[PDB]
Structure formats: structure tokens, C-alpha cells
Design a protein around this ligand. Structure first.
Ligand SMILES: [N-]=[N+]=NCCC[C@H]1C(=O)N(Cc2cccc3ccccc23)C[C@@H]2N(C(=O)NCCCC(F)(F)F)CCC(=O)N21
Ligand SMILES: [N-]=[N+]=NCCC[C@H]1C(=O)N(Cc2cccc3ccccc23)C[C@@H]2N(C(=O)NCCCC(F)(F)F)CCC(=O)N21
Ligand SMILES: [N-]=[N+]=NCCC[C@H]1C(=O)N(Cc2cccc3ccccc23)C[C@@H]2N(C(=O)NCCCC(F)(F)F)CCC(=O)N21
Ligand SMILES: [N-]=[N+]=NCCC[C@H]1C(=O)N(Cc2cccc3ccccc23)C[C@@H]2N(C(=O)NCCCC(F)(F)F)CCC(=O)N21
Ligand SMILES: [N-]=[N+]=NCCC[C@H]1C(=O)N(Cc2cccc3ccccc23)C[C@@H]2N(C(=O)NCCCC(F)(F)F)CCC(=O)N21
Ligand SMILES: [N-]=[N+]=NCCC[C@H]1C(=O)N(Cc2cccc3ccccc23)C[C@@H]2N(C(=O)NCCCC(F)(F)F)CCC(=O)N21
Ligand SMILES: [N-]=[N+]=NCCC[C@H]1C(=O)N(Cc2cccc3ccccc23)C[C@@H]2N(C(=O)NCCCC(F)(F)F)CCC(=O)N21
Ligand SMILES: [N-]=[N+]=NCCC[C@H]1C(=O)N(Cc2cccc3ccccc23)C[C@@H]2N(C(=O)NCCCC(F)(F)F)CCC(=O)N21
Ligand SMILES: [N-]=[N+]=NCCC[C@H]1C(=O)N(Cc2cccc3ccccc23)C[C@@H]2N(C(=O)NCCCC(F)(F)F)CCC(=O)N21
Lengths: 186, 186, 187, 185, 185, 184, 182, 187, 190
């Protein structure tokens, strides 16, 4: 049950009013379509002011993740990315896809990078097509990470061969984020 | 949970429909086709001249449902722009190609896939024959229209759709399924 | 799932009903038939002169639910237009063929299918006989009305419905199931 | 529990000693392999004496049936066919396949003929291949039935379009069997 | 069915007075809602205390840290009040409240244990998962050490298995500052 | 379908306006959280006026029950308890937890007391911990019942060993309630 | 399964006259049995022909290759006789019989296609499985070319999808030598 | 149905055991290991000098069950030949490599596969650590023995077993898992 | 499918299933999870072998993940009761009650092959119902553990308190480690 805040907003709709979008679950097409539409709407409201993408996600669909990636790059406003809780797989990809100098993580947040997961069954030719497709998809993802992080493509491939868990501070020095957002007031 | 925007209160997809943006964001069944057909007809009645924008993030689905969307696009006066974000596969890519000439787009990292239609039949040989003839006719009809829409020959469409054929956004433009790859201008 | 329209706030399908368009967009069960019957009666009461438009994207379903729609169409004063978009199969195509003469339409890539009715029976020989005779009378009743609506003879309908018979929008017109293929004029 | 008779035999193996093979179930590969083995065994014991194929079966696999059919035709001994209870689909095809003048049914035995059953899922090209395969298989069945019964291929195709039940007498005059084996007073 | 007051649902009414309800197993949905609420209450009033009700058996560690980090990031003191139970990540969040303002009511139950997880597949994948959960445990223990005043190794021994504590025992442990006494009538 | 009464209220929210809280189901964390919130709301609405806790419950979670218990004792207003239908296990504990002199049952209401239920699976040391935990919980429940009823702990222990059903009148003489509320 | 009279079950009686029955889907259990039978028949008599009955929809590739290698290893000629059907690895094994001694009965069905498989998990795991089944296909197609006389590129085209053949069509393709007429 | 052979009525696998052939033709579990251990012990007692022949067509399975077989092979006096027919995967290929040196074979089209051991663990971080340390020790143990049996270095074994690694019979020979590919006589 | 072995005699052919042939030479196979069926069979086998010869050694083969404690104690007590020495040999694995029974073999005749795995841990159980029912089950399994630990201490030479710490969680041991622990006497080398 999502609480209401007083016009009357559900808490997530209230956050959208101050240009905060919530990527808070597994990335499927429904989540992507919603985050795309929110990005488009916020552009139309104001092309100058920053948008804030909250990321607490284990990842999910690559294609759905790319719907969000492209929409972030297409629109005029800077899209800040803030990892809170965890950003894994396509979650961590989108965290690195934020506007330069405005990608953050909170101190105890967990960033994880790995290679894409998929499947194929049937004839040897069908297996070959699926294998060729997912290998092209991985290289596409590794290319963009290399550009976004400033690590070489070969380093990205080695480090994503298996699940690679990084602390907030480790994700900064890797180049996935720009800053560990510390508690100033405390 | 779909967020709400206030600018009167709209759910996000209804706010997009106010600016003539329809969302084809899931598998194509009869329910999705009927919702889209109704949105198309409604937007015509509001304004028969202004452009409609059909967002496509879909893996295809039912062929007859897809054709309900196709025929309703062609019937109405407004240009329906097609925009592949995320992925457009099978009947999704067909409906991408059915967009108004000069206004079929795909974002850079969007995935396009074409293949032949999928079906099934069980029972007596006479029933298998009838179902086999039906799905072959259905493929000829799809290949006919894809040839007319892309500029490729029917024989090339049939070879290239014999098994799953993945295409980048740029490869989709070279093939004639889209007109432009919508680059990040800003 | 369903988008809202502000033109008072309507869900999209309700906005279409305001312009006398009814959506038969699913498998025909009793819930669907009751809704459509209630819509037909409402539109009559608003205006007995103006046309009603029955959008048909349906694979068929319950025969009796189909006849609930059929009888309510024939009972009311207004002409009810039928427009096949996507597909109209089994009782879907029967209802497509039940539209007011000269106002049964299909868009060019719509699919039409006709067959005999489907049913079942399990138990004693006497119960199987009763169920068999019932479904046979139902088929004759369906074929008699299809003959009258299309102009084809009862024996031609019985051969052409013996198995699944797929027809294009154009083939549906020349069979007599529709009157006109609604071609795109602006293109 | 199959009873034993006395050298001790289970009852079916006792029947096999007198050259009687029991086709008493759905025709799958295991049943076909056993009957094929039995036919080859009985040939080796005596290439001349008749073999008696009891048929109480609803049919089953077409390829498994043709394993039985071809093995019947290949071997030297005449293979009598006896429909008791029922012979349906490939069961009735095998009933018709017996040695000429030696295909029998008992008076209340049921004979049914229909077209083959199958299935296909996936791409339109895969569906096309399965359709063409099963249609060829039906033509193959109807051609052999035509030769065996004396009826035309076109009549067999009309009479097998839907389930078609026949009495013993009706199956005789159709040409599926030669005689109705009546009980003596 | 949640009751309404005049029109707020009861939980939304509590949120109007800066009370947030952590009353279920901690998953990502619950974490995102609480994070959103914490950020909203900061924006309304950056000075005034927030009150975090905890009746939770724990759940996801990463979801718990989403809540933990947001509490530490915002300016307002976040009071924590254990009512019913605070277990696992629940008790971690109870200890994470503003110093001097972590409470439990007299019959509330506080439980602490080590995190739970899983791994299946190759030895190398099991190794990676094992090193990951051990690092997560050390991170949890380091922060609990800081919050309670107890040593990291005392936390490790005391969380090796389920360790149930009364409200009073939790206070002397350093998980809470006070056992909340009844209001003055 | 819960009926509405007319400002429009669903029937339970209407009862909440007049300081009546419904504990009408199994006690889990959700029920407890709702009731806790209602008790805190009614305190803020008026610190003086009585609150009425309707109890028709088979019990449930002990920790969820203690969330309701502690919140009752915390707040300023007297909380009346009224058992209608049944109060079993933690249900009867909460019945007994009402303000002194204002714990009621209607004449055919069923009151049942028993010991807590739980479980454990795994290693002997895990079983021991789970066993020690549930025994301390029983000692905690029995100590508070002793105080609330006037019965000795050892009498509570014997009487809760197995399921012990009590009539409304029997509940009064035991000390779980103060009065059987007769027809007016 | 009936008995004949010492007492034999019918399949064991056929093994006494050097006949092996491949009458089911090819899994490891069927392959271990047939390999053991082949070895036993070699030891009894290294010169006399062995007769492999084939009524099989195919099955595991590796299990099929257990039977294939053992046929090629032993001294006796193994005749292959397709009765009912020989599909996929069943047809591969049919083509593997001694040269001039591969048969099918008139109405027997022979089918050839490419091997089936599957893979799930990481892209690197999918790549390995893809490369493995592609190698397995080249190996199967290579041997069929040698056994039939057809080119590797013709075998790859004809096995791209399910391809059904009559007994007569199997002869002129080179999968068998003779149609055994009654 | 396993066929019977008469000379004394043996089932076909028992007939093979008479001539000192043991069949490892399935997934390795405790039952299979116990049976193979017992056969090895029995064959030793019959004749401590003559070779034993271990047929391997197996996808592998339990590591401890596999080591039951490994140790019993090494314990007994007779040489235990190994012959891969069809496939030897994981612990299957380990046991293939464990045959008497100079007497480890594969037929030309036999698939040999080497990877790292598989396992799992659910529960507390401490319980996950114990299960992780156990399987890592087990992999080191397997890799050390493979090194001694093949002549390859431990670090090369480590890299080549990190993922599923399929080898042909010939590739298994040059890797050192087998000594000979048993080619057929011409034609 | 358990293979059968046929040996020629002067008066025909004698057929044994392989495990029954091992029993002829006083070898008993503990090759599975220890349930009551496994225990009863092993108990009966021990009793039979005693009656055949009260002086000759019996050989207990152990490849077992453990199982029922009471079933294990059926085997344990029967071993101790009979006169013949019962050698124990771990091949593959001996875990939990498996390793306990390994440790229970005749002093000096407990073995393991070099790559055999030996694991010790505390007993497993469960309880559901009333607090008092939980108490009884808890007290019962705790007494069972004390009983297991006390006998292991006598058999290994390790103190009760070290056994308790070493069995608190799953403790995997190599064959050599099991020797030095006192669970076995010798690693039987090739
Ligand atoms: N180079 N260049 N660029 C700018 C051309 C954008 C173009 C277009 O292609 N689309 C298609 C589209 C659909 C869905 C999601 C998308 C995400 C990323 C990009 C495109 C998307 C919609 C957009 N409109 C708009 O924003 N209207 C304002 C209303 C937005 C609302 F408030 F409804 F959200 C309507 C007017 C128009 O011409 N366009
Ligand atoms: N170009 N051209 N033309 C020819 C006019 C079309 C004609 C008709 O055939 N239909 C049937 C129909 C139903 C459903 C979906 C369809 C999709 C494609 C084609 C037809 C469809 C409805 C339409 N009306 C309308 O749009 N009224 C405006 C309201 C629209 C709303 F806002 F409700 F959506 C009512 C008046 C009328 O005569 N028609
Ligand atoms: N002989 N004769 N014939 C023509 C008068 C019809 C007659 C009748 O038989 N019914 C029964 C009926 C119920 C439900 C669905 C039906 C569908 C098809 C036919 C009948 C139906 C109701 C109708 N009314 C009405 O339409 N009122 C207008 C309001 C309609 C609304 F707007 F509510 F939908 C009330 C007054 C009345 O006498 N009748
Ligand atoms: N006409 N004619 N033809 C007989 C010559 C045929 C030839 C052959 O092709 N086969 C293969 C075969 C296998 C299985 C089932 C089959 C069914 C139909 C046809 C062939 C079959 C076996 C047969 N043998 C035999 O029958 N031996 C007698 C013993 C039989 C037993 F008693 F074991 F069953 C061994 C000697 C031999 O050269 N052949
Ligand atoms: N001290 N300090 N520092 C740093 C300034 C915070 C900064 C920011 O980093 N975010 C990202 C963010 C998103 C979601 C959850 C988060 C939880 C914890 C931290 C960050 C979070 C959003 C925030 N905004 C805001 O609060 N606007 C007021 C409305 C809040 C609402 F009412 F909607 F909740 C918009 C303006 C802005 O610059 N920021
Ligand atoms: N004011 N005061 N006082 C009395 C001081 C109590 C103190 C506190 O400890 N909490 C924590 C708390 C949370 C949830 C359930 C609890 C149940 C029992 C005890 C504590 C609870 C919240 C409370 N607030 C309040 O009641 N505000 C009134 C509105 C209540 C509403 F109507 F929203 F329910 C906010 C102001 C405040 O300092 N407190
Ligand atoms: N030419 N050539 N060939 C074969 C002699 C090779 C050699 C060998 O490599 N094996 C291993 C082996 C096991 C299982 C299946 C196999 C299949 C194909 C090849 C090998 C196989 C066993 C064989 N023996 C034998 O056949 N003894 C006869 C009895 C056979 C029985 F009747 F038991 F089956 C024991 C004596 C011996 O040195 N060998
Ligand atoms: N030097 N040295 N070393 C070691 C002496 C071996 C010793 C022993 O330790 N065992 C235990 C044992 C059980 C099960 C499987 C084992 C596998 C590998 C090693 C041991 C095994 C049994 C063996 N016996 C025997 O083989 N008898 C021959 C008949 C065997 C039969 F035919 F029954 F299988 C009985 C006489 C005897 O003293 N031993
Ligand atoms: N030391 N010690 N001694 C053995 C004398 C003990 C005594 C007894 O208490 N039992 C009960 C018993 C039952 C089952 C399992 C047991 C396991 C452990 C102890 C006892 C068991 C049976 C035994 N008998 C016997 O062994 N007869 C020999 C035949 C054995 C066979 F071959 F059948 F297995 C019959 C004669 C007799 O007085 N006894």
C-alpha cells in the first residue's frame, strides 16, 4: 500500500513533480515504457532543469534497459543517476549512463557488473543465431561501458566475465560513478 | 504502479495520449490492438491533420491483432510516425515499417528483428493441411506488404525472414524498415 | 492498461460509445453479450434514427451469447453497421454478416473465418443423443440465417463450413458476408 | 496377473507355441518390435505353416504399423488376421493386410477406419513440411488400402475423412476382411 | 481493509505527522516507499524529527541499506521505535536511528543474526557468492559496532546464531537508547 | 463488499470516528500495524475519552499481539475491551489487557486460553535456541496474565497447558474480564 | 514380452541368431546394451554377419556415436535394416551399416535433419554450446558424405530442416543400398 | 529390457563381467560407485594378474562416488584399462584419465569433456563459507590428480576447466587424458 | 541393475548378485543413507556372520552420507555386541552417522582410502507444536548429541568439549586429517 501526500499525490507521483524518477524494481518492458514516458514528460515541462534517476535495481531485460539508455541520451536535460541499495547488471549500466559529473552512489550501496544472460534451444543453426546475437549484444554493452567509464574494452570483458561486486568507493575509482554522496549533515 | 501527472490529473500514458503519442509497449494480443485502434480513431476525430506518434517497444505477437493496428493506421488521414525504442520484433518490426514514409524512426541502440510467422495445428491430416495453407498465405501477405514498404524484393524478404534475423538501427535503415536513426542532437 | 481521455473524463472505449461505436473485441461469452446488448439498448434510447457501429475483432465463442447480440441487433430500430478489423471468426463472422444490408464492412487485411459449431457431451448414450441433436439443430439454425444473410444456398454453406474456411476481406465480400472492403481513400 | 499353464508357459507364450501372435493393445514401437520379432521367429521355425494375428487394437503409430505390415509381407508364411473386439485406424489397416482369403472378423467385432492423426508447431516452413509429410503418409495408406480392398483411392479418402464405424459384415463387403467367422450350432 | 479518517487512509494520516511505517518484510518495494517518504519529509521540514515505526522480521540486506543510507543522508533526526519485533535487518535499522532517540516498548522483541543467502553452480561462482556475503556481513558488523559501542568480534559471536533480546537487554547492548515508558495520564 | 454510510464512510471507518477499533480477524503484523496506528490516531484526537476495542479473534502472532498490547498500555486514553463471538489465545490475552473495570464479554462469547505455538528445524543448537525463545515467551505471557487476572503464574501454567475453553461468566470469575455485558 | 522354449524372451532368442534390436529412442541405456551385444557377438564369431534392426526416432548424438564406433571397431559386417522408421541418429546409424548390406523394407520411413540441443546462462556459456553443436554437426555431415557419396554442402542443405524420404528415395540418396522387396 | 545370454544364463552386462569388463554407463551416484567398487574387488579375487576393462559412457556426477571408484582402481593389483565410448564428461573424464598408464583409450568419435566441479549452498554466511571452502578444496584435489595423470601443470588445468571444455578423442590424447585413440581396421 | 556373478562348481553353476557374493567373504556394504531398512539388514548380516564364524574378521564398507541416529545406533550396538572384530573402511564418503560408524570399528582396524572424504557435524531434527512439545524435542536431541559426543570422545581420544566445537558446523576432513583426528587408524595406501 503506497501512501498518499497532500492536490493529492501518491508518494511516487509527488517525487515525479520535483523531477525524480524511480527505477526501483527488475527492468522489464513495463518499467522501461513508464520510465521513458516520465523522461519525455519531464523534458516537455523543462528542458533545462536536471532530472534525477533513483536506481535500486537488480537489472533485467537488455532491450528494455536500452530503451531507457537511449531516452536519457536523446533528451536535453542532464539525467543524474543515484544508486541507492543496489545497481546490478543493466541497473549498473544505467547508473554509468547518467550525465557526466552527476552519477552518484550512497556509501553502503552495492554496484554489480556482469555479462548478459540468455538462452537458446532447437536446431544448431538456431543456437548459432542466438549465440551470435547475444555476443554482439555483449560487445555493444562493453563498448558503451568503456566509453562511459574510461576503462578499455578488454578490461570490461575480463571484469564482467563473472559477477563482480563493487563498493560505492570502488565503483567511483572504476569510473561507473563520479562521487560517493556522503552524509554532510552527520 | 503507473505514476500520475497534474497539468487536471492524468496517468502518464494518458498525458502522452493528450499530445497524440500512442504506446505500443507490450506483446500484441487482441486487447492491445483494440486499445490502439481506439486511440488512433480518437486522435483522428480530435485532429485529422496533425501527426500521431506510435512508440514501439514490442516482441510482436498475434498477426491478426497486428493487422488491426496496420489497417487502422492506413485508413486514417493523419500521418502515424513510428518510433522503435528498446525493441521491435516480428509483427512489431512490421508495424515499425508501416509508419508514414519519411517518419519511421529508431533510436541508435534499438533492436529490430524480422522472422516468419509462428503457429500450430494438431488433429487430422486435413486439418493440418488447412492450417498449413493458412499460415503460408499469411506469410505471403506479410512478405507482400514488407516488400512494398521496404523496397526489397519478395524473394529477398522470404530468404532474410527464414530464420530469426537481428538488425541494428543503422542496419534497419539500410534495409528500409526505418527512414532515419534518431541521433542525440543535444 | 486502458488510457483515459479528457474531451468530463472517459476511458477510451467509453469515449467511442459516446459516438455510438460498440467494441466486440474479444471471445464471445455471456458477460460480453450482456454488455453489448445493454449498449445497443442504450444507444436506441438516445437516438432511434442514427447508426450504430459494431467493431468486430473476435474469434467467436458461445453460440447463445452470439444470438443474444444478434437478436438485440435485429430488434432495435437503428441500422447497426458491422466492421471487421483484425479478425472475425466463427460467431464473430456470423455477427459480421448480421449487420444492416449495405453497411457490413471489412478493412483490406482483416481475416474472416467460417466453420460449424463446436461442443461436447459425456455420459449415457441417451444423453449423448440429446446433445448431438441439440448441436445439429443449432448448426441448421446458424446455416439458415447465413443463407438468408449472404444469398448462398443452405447446402453450399454446409459444405463451406464443414472445416475451418479462411477468407480474405475481398473473398468475404463476394461470398456475401460483407458488402464493401473499406479501402484507404487518403492513401 | 497373467496366468500360467503347464514345461511352464504364460498364456500368450503358449499361444505363440501354436503360431498365434496377439496384437492386443495400442500400436507403439515396443508392440511393433515384439510382433516383428515374433513373425521372424515363427518363419524360422516353419516357413510354410500359417501364422495367426489376433487383432484387438485401437491403432496408434503409423510407422510402427508399417513395421508390422512390411514384416508380414516380407515373410514366406501366410499371416491370417482375426478381428476380435475391435480393429481401428492402423489396427484395421493391419486387419486388411492379412493373407488373401484369410482375413476374418467375429460377428460382433467392431471395425473403424479414419485418416491419420498428427501435429506440428513452430515456423510456417516447419508446419508446411509436417503437413506435406502427413498428407503423403495418408496417400500411402489409401493406396495400399485400395489395393487390399478393391475400392478406389477416392472412395477410401471420402470414407476415411471422419471416423467411420463398420460392422463385421459391412467390413467384409467393404473388402477389409474376407469372411465373418460365424459360430457353429 | 485499511480504515479511512477525515480523507486519508490511516497510514497516510500518520505520514502527515512525520511517522513512517516499516511494518513488513523488507524488500525493494518497501525500501523504495520508505526512501521516498524520508526524502519528502526532509523537503517539508529539514529541522523536525521523523519517527520510524519498526515492526519487521528483516529481509533484503541491500533494501535495508537503501533505507539506512537515506536516513544518514537527510538532515532531520530519524527516531526509531521498535513495536512488536525488530529482527535481522529490522534490528539493524532500529540501531541506525538518531543517537539518543532509538526506542523499544517494554514487551517488544529484538533479534540479531548473521545474513542469509545462497549459491548454486560452479566452484568459482560459489566462491564469488561466498566472498560477497562475507563482505556484506563484515560491513553490517562494522556499522553495528559503531552504533552500539560493542566490538566487531563480539557482534560476530552474538550474531552467529539467532539471538533474542528483550527491550531492556537491547538497551544495555546499545541497540536502543531507551525503553519507552507509558505516557503521563 | 463493505457497506457505506453517509461525508461518506465505509462502516468500519464510521465506527473509528466514534473511537471503536475492530480486532476482527487473525492477528498478523498487518492487523497489528493497523490497530497500532488507530490507537495513536485516537489518542491525538482526544487524550481523555475512552477507546473501544472490539475483539472477535482466534489469536495469531505473539509479537504482533504484543505490538497491540504495548500500544494500549502506552497511550493516555483507557481502552475498553469487548469480546463478541470469540477471543482465543492472543485474542484472550488482549481481552485481559483492557483497562481495569472496563473489560467485557457478551453472554455467549467464547474465551479460550492456551500456551504459544511455534516450531524449529535444523541443528540441535538451533532447536535449543528456538526452544529457549518460546519458553521465555510463555513465561512473559504468563507473568502478564497473572498480573491482569490476579491468578498465580503456576495456575496460569497448568490452565494453559492444553486448550482451555471458558464461558463469558467463567472468564469473569477467572479475571480475564470484569463484567458480562447483559442485554439493555 | 513373450517367451519361447531352456527359455528365452523373444529379443534374447533373436540375439542367439546374431540379430540386435534398436527399437526405441537412443539414450545411454540403449547404447550400452547394443555396444555390449556387438561385443558379445564378435567374441562368439568374428566372421559371421550381425544384423542391426532399426526402428528408431533417434535420440542422443553421443549415445548414437557409441553404437557407430563399436560397429566400425568390430570385425564382423553389421547389416542395417530399417523397418518402420529411422529418423535423425536412427538414419545416421542406418547409413553406417556394412557397405552393400544396408537395407530398408518398402514402406519404411527414413528422415534426416540437423542435431538438436540447447543452452542457457551467460553469453560465454552460450558461445561454447553453439561451437560444440556446430562441430558435432560438421562431424555428422562429414561422415554422411563419406557413407552416401553426396557432398558436404548437399548434406548441409538437405538436413537444414526435417527431410522425409521413402525407402526408394533413401536408396538413390545413398543412405541404404537395397530396398528389400517381398 | 536387457537381453539374456546362455552358454549358465547371464544378463548381457553380467556376461561382460565374466570376461573382466565393467560398465560405467550412467550418471555417477553412490549406487553405481558401490556396484563398480564391488566388481573391482571381485575381479581382483578371481585373478590378481589379468587386466580389467572399464567401459566409460557417462556424463559424470558425484565427486565422492567418483573417488570411491578412483581409489579402488588404484588400490587393486590388476591394471584397470579405461575405454571411453560415446562420452566421458566431468568425473567421467577424470576416471578415464585414472586408467592404467599406457592403457587408457577412446574410440574415434567419443566426446570427452572437462570442467570444474558443480555444487550449492543455502543458509547463513558461515554455512556458505564452509561449503565454498569445501568445493574449492575438492577442485584443487581433482586438479592436482589430473596434473599427475596428464602431465599438464596445475595452472593450465585450472584455466582449461574454468568453463566447459569439449575435446575430441584425438585432442584428449594430446592433452594426456588418454594414451591411444582406438582406430578401426580398414573398411 | 545389480550385476550377477556365476562361478563353476563340481555340481553345476552357483549364481550370486555381487553384494551377496561379497557377504560370502564377510564384507558388509553400508552404501546408502542410513534408514531403518539399511540398519535392520546390516544388523542381520552381522548376526549371521558371527554365527558362521565367531573368530574371523568382518569388513564394513562405508560410503554413506549418514541418516537416522537411532538406525546408526542399531548398527553401532550390534557391532559392539558381537565377538568378531568389525573392520571399517571409508571409500568415497563417510558423513555424520556414517563417520560415527567409521569411528566405531575395531581399534586398529579402521581405514580410509586416500581420497575418501570424512565429515562430522551435530545431529539434525525438528519440532512443531506447543512450547512444551518444543522443549521435550529440544531436550531429547540435546541428550542425543551428548550421547554421540561422549562415544566419539572415547573412540577418538578427543575431549567432549573439542568434539562439540568441531561438530558445531559441517567439518570436512581428508582421509589423512581423519586419521590424525582419531576417527580412523590408517590411510590404506596403494
Ligand atoms: N532530434 N530530435 N527531436 C524531438 C522529436 C520528438 C518527437 C518524437 O519523435 N516522439 C516519439 C516518442 C514517443 C515516446 C517516447 C519517446 C522518447 C524519446 C524520443 C521520442 C519518443 C514524441 C515527441 N513529442 C513530445 O515530446 N511532445 C510533448 C509531450 C510529451 C509528454 F508530455 F506527453 F510526455 C511529440 C512531438 C514530436 O515531434 N516528438
Ligand atoms: N477517414 N475515414 N472514414 C469513414 C468514417 C468511419 C465510420 C466507421 O466506419 N466506424 C467504424 C469503426 C469503429 C472502430 C474502429 C474503426 C477503425 C477504422 C475504421 C472504422 C472503425 C466508426 C466512424 N465514426 C467516428 O470515428 N466518430 C468519431 C469518434 C471517434 C472517437 F472519438 F470516438 F474515437 C462514427 C461515424 C462513422 O461513420 N465511422
Ligand atoms: N414488443 N416490443 N418492444 C420494444 C419495448 C422494449 C421493452 C422491453 O421489452 N425491455 C426488455 C429488455 C431488457 C433488456 C434488454 C433488452 C434487449 C432487447 C429487447 C428487450 C430488452 C426493456 C424496454 N425498455 C427500454 O428500452 N427503456 C429505455 C432505456 C434503455 C436504457 F437507456 F436504459 F438502456 C423499458 C420499457 C419497455 O417496455 N421495453
Ligand atoms: N523372406 N526371408 N528371410 C530371412 C533373411 C533376412 C535376414 C535379415 O535381413 N535379417 C534382418 C531382420 C532383423 C529383425 C527383423 C527383421 C524383419 C524382417 C526382415 C528382416 C529382419 C535377419 C534374418 N535372419 C533370420 O531370420 N534368422 C532366423 C532366426 C530368427 C529368430 F528365430 F531368431 F527370430 C538372420 C539371417 C539373415 O540373413 N536375415
Ligand atoms: N544535504 N543534501 N543533498 C543532495 C541534494 C539531493 C538531490 C538528489 O540527489 N536527489 C536524488 C535522489 C532521488 C531519490 C531519492 C534520494 C534519496 C536520497 C538522496 C538522493 C535521492 C533528489 C533531490 N531533490 C529533492 O529532494 N527535491 C525535493 C522534493 C522531494 C520530494 F518531496 F519529492 F520527496 C531534487 C533536487 C536535488 O538536487 N536532490
Ligand atoms: N504529538 N505527540 N506525542 C507522544 C510522543 C510519541 C512520539 C513517538 O514516539 N512516536 C513513535 C510511534 C510511531 C508509531 C506508533 C507508536 C505507538 C506508540 C508509541 C509511539 C509510536 C510518534 C509520536 N507522534 C504522534 O503521536 N503524533 C500525533 C498524530 C498521530 C496520528 F494522528 F498521526 F496518528 C509524533 C510526535 C511524537 O513525538 N511521537
Ligand atoms: N577386433 N576387436 N576387439 C575387442 C578386444 C579389445 C579389448 C578392449 O578394449 N575392451 C574394452 C571394451 C569394453 C566394452 C565395450 C567395448 C566396445 C568396443 C571396443 C572395446 C570395448 C574389452 C575387450 N575384451 C573382449 O572383448 N572379450 C570377449 C568377451 C566379450 C564379451 F562376450 F564378454 F562381451 C576383453 C579383452 C580385450 O583385450 N578387449
Ligand atoms: N596388502 N593389503 N590390503 C587390504 C586387505 C583387503 C581387506 C579389506 O580391507 N576389505 C574391505 C573392503 C570392502 C569393500 C571394498 C573394498 C575396496 C578396496 C579395499 C577394501 C575394500 C575387504 C578385503 N577382502 C577381500 O577382498 N576378499 C576377496 C573376495 C572379494 C570378493 F570376491 F568377495 F569380492 C576380505 C579380506 C580382507 O582382508 N580385505
Ligand atoms: N555375542 N553374541 N550373540 C548371539 C546370542 C543372542 C540371542 C539374542 O539375544 N538374539 C536377539 C537378536 C535378534 C536380532 C538381532 C540381534 C542383534 C544383536 C543382539 C541380539 C539380536 C538372537 C540370538 N540368536 C542367534 O544369533 N542365532 C544364530 C543365527 C543367526 C543367524 F544366522 F540367523 F543370523 C538366537 C539365539 C540367542 O539366544 N540369541
Amino acid at each position: 500500500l503506497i501512501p498518499t501526500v497532500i492536490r493529492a499525490y501518491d508518494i511516487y507521483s509527488r517525487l515525479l513533480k520535483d523531477r525524480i524518477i524511480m527505477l526501483g524494481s527488475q527492468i522489464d518492458d513495463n518499467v522501461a515504457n513508464s520510465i521513458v514516458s516520465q523522461l519525455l514528460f519531464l523534458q516537455a515541462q523543462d528542458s533545462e532543469k536536471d532530472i534525477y534517476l533513483y536506481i535500486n535495481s537488480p537489472g533485467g531485460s537488455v532491450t528494455a534497459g536500452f530503451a531507457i539508455y537511449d531516452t536519457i541520451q536523446h533528451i536535453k536535460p542532464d539525467v543524474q543517476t543515484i544508486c541507492i541499495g543496489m545497481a546490478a547488471s543493466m541497473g549498473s549500466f544505467l547508473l554509468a549512463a547518467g550525465a557526466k559529473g552527476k552519477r552518484f552512489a550512497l556509501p553502503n550501496a552495492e554496484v554489480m557488473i556482469h555479462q548478459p544472460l540468455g538462452g537458446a534451444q532447437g536446431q544448431a543453426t538456431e543456437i548459432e543465431i542466438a549465440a551470435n546475437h547475444i555476443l554482439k549484444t555483449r560487445e555493444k554493452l562493453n563498448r558503451i561501458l568503456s566509453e562511459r567509464t574510461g576503462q578499455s574494452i578488454e578490461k570490461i570483458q575480463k571484469d564482467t566475465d563473472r559477477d563482480n561486486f563493487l563498493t560505492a568507493e570502488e565503483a567511483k575509482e572504476y569510473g561507473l560513478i563520479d562521487e560517493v554522496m556522503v552524509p554532510e549533515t552527520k
